[PDB]
Design a binder for this molecule. Sequence first.
Ligand SMILES: O=C(O)CC[C@H](NCC(=O)[C@@H](O)[C@H](O)[C@H](O)CO)C(=O)O
Length: 326
Amino acid sequence: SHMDVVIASSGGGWQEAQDKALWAPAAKALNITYTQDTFQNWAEARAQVESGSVTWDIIQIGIADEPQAKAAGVLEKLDPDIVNKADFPPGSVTDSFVANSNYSTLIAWNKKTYGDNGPKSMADFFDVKKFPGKRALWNQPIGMIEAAALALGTPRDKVYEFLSTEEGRKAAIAKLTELAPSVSVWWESGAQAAQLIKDGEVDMIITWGGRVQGAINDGANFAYTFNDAQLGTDGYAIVKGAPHRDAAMRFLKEMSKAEYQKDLPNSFATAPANMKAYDLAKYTPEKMATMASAPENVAVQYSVDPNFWAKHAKWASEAYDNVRLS
Ligand SMILES: O=C(O)CC[C@H](NCC(=O)[C@@H](O)[C@H](O)[C@H](O)CO)C(=O)O
C-alpha cells in the first residue's frame, strides 16, 4: 500500500505493544513510513500470494505456522545476516522467520465461578464434572489438539510422541468432541478472548498469557496458571512477492535489535526473543514472573513442535473444524 511498508499482526494489546516498542521507533531510526494491518490466520497471506495481488510486506506469525507457510510458497527467504542467531533461542530464527517474542497458550479461569480452586491442569480444564461451566477455546488447532492430549493424561514431555500415531491423534480429537458441548465460544482473536475474560462471559478459557494478564490489569476477576501451558514463539516473515521487499528486510533487521526488544514488555505481558534485551532492560523479578520463557514458568510447560504441524496441520485443521461445528 502506497510507498509504505505494510506490517500485519493480530490486533489488540499485542499489536499496540509491537507498534510502540518496535515499529514506530525502528521506522523513525530508518526514516521510513509504514502502514499497519490486522489478520488472524497465515492462510490470508496465502490467499494474497495465490491471487497475485500482494499488499502485505511483513506478517507476524507463529513458529509452528512457518513450516506450513514456507512449504506453500508464502514466505520470502530472508537475507542471511538479518539477525545474529546466537542472540535468539535455538530454532527461533530460520531462513524465513525471525522471532520477536515467547508467549504461553495457557488456562485462565473465572474467580467468580471457582474462586482460587480453578482448573490447574488440562485434565481439570476437560473435567466438566469437577468444574462445571462454560469453556472457550481458539477456533484454530495449535495448542488445542495438544491440550486434549494432555487432558488424556499424556506427560508434558510426550505430547508429540503420543500425537505421532493415528490412534493418539484420533483420541485427542475424541477428547475435544467430548468437551465440545461445554464450549460456549470458539474465540477468534486475542482481543475477543480478553473481552470474554473482562466481561466474565466464560468460566474458563485456553488463550495467550499476555491477553489474560491485560484483561486482569483491566479489572477482570480471573486467575491463570502456566501449568500444562504451551510455550510458543511469535515472529516475523516477509510475504513472497512483497511490494516493498528490500525496505521490509531493512525494517525487520532494525526492529529485531535489542534496543527495541527491551521495550516490548513495557505495557504488554510478553517475553522478548532477543536474549540481549534482558541485559539492557534489567527486568524486576515481578516483571520476570509474568514471562512465558522465565525459568520458573518454563519448568511447568512444554514447547510447541513446528515439525508436528509441518506434517499434520491439514488433518488437524479439518478434524478441529468438524469439532467446532457442533
Ligand atoms: O507473542 C506474544 O506475546 C503474543 C501472543 C499471541 N500471538 C499468537 C499469534 O501468533 C497471533 O498473533 C496470530 O494468530 C498470528 O499473528 C496470525 O498469524 C497474541 O496475539 O496474544
